[PDB]
Design a protein around this ligand. Structure first.
Ligand code: LI0
Length: 145
């Protein structure tokens, strides 16, 4: 709660900055710090390895003004259908970023605000329970820092 929310905005703003665009950055606003970085690099290397797979993921969802949060959670469960894991999770963050980057290409920067929220809810009702039973995020940074 809250904490995870900060990570989203950070990861999002970061993914956007990579494409030139910008937004409410959060690299040194709240806390975490190490986590934000660990997750930042991870998402970068992750996509680099699975450039093909992920490419299909983003194509399995076209976020639009008339899109229900359900559709989103439906596409995020398929990945976590065979149990949750640090890696598969790292993708979730990347998935949200892609959808956002696409929302900006179609002149729709008012969606990123909604996408960020959707990720927060899904994180605090599907991943939070697990992350807590895996040594919190501190473990993710200690293993994949
Ligand atoms: C086809 O099924 C898939 C593709 C897919 C299916 C459906 C929808 C979307 C995608 C499902 C998604 N997927 C993978 C592939 C591997 C793992 C994996 O190795 N997980 S892990 O828990 O073993 C791990 C390994 C390495 C790192 N970090 C390193 C050491 C820095 C390497 S870079 C990296 C980062 C994060 C994840 C993986 C690599 C981290 N981590 O940082 O959390 C975590 C997880 C999902 C590709 C196949």
């Amino acid at each position: 709660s809250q904490s995870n929310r900060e990570l989203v905005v950070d990861f999002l703003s970061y993914k956007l900055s990579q494409k030139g665009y910008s937004a409410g950055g959060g690299g040194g606003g709240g806390g975490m710090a190490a986590v934000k970085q660990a997750l930042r690099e991870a998402g970068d290397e992750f996509e680099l390895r699975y450039r093909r797979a992920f490419s299909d993921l983003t194509s399995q969802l076209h976020i639009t003004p008339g899109t229900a949060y359900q559709s989103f959670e439906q596409v995020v469960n398929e990945l976590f259908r065979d149990g949750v894991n640090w890696g598969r999770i790292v993708a979730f963050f990347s998935f949200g970023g892609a959808l956002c980057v696409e929302s900006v290409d179609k002149e729709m920067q008012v969606l990123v605000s909604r996408i960020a929220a959707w990720m927060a809810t899904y994180l605090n009702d599907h991943l939070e329970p697990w992350i807590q039973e895996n040594g919190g995020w501190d473990t993710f940074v200690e293993l994949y820092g």
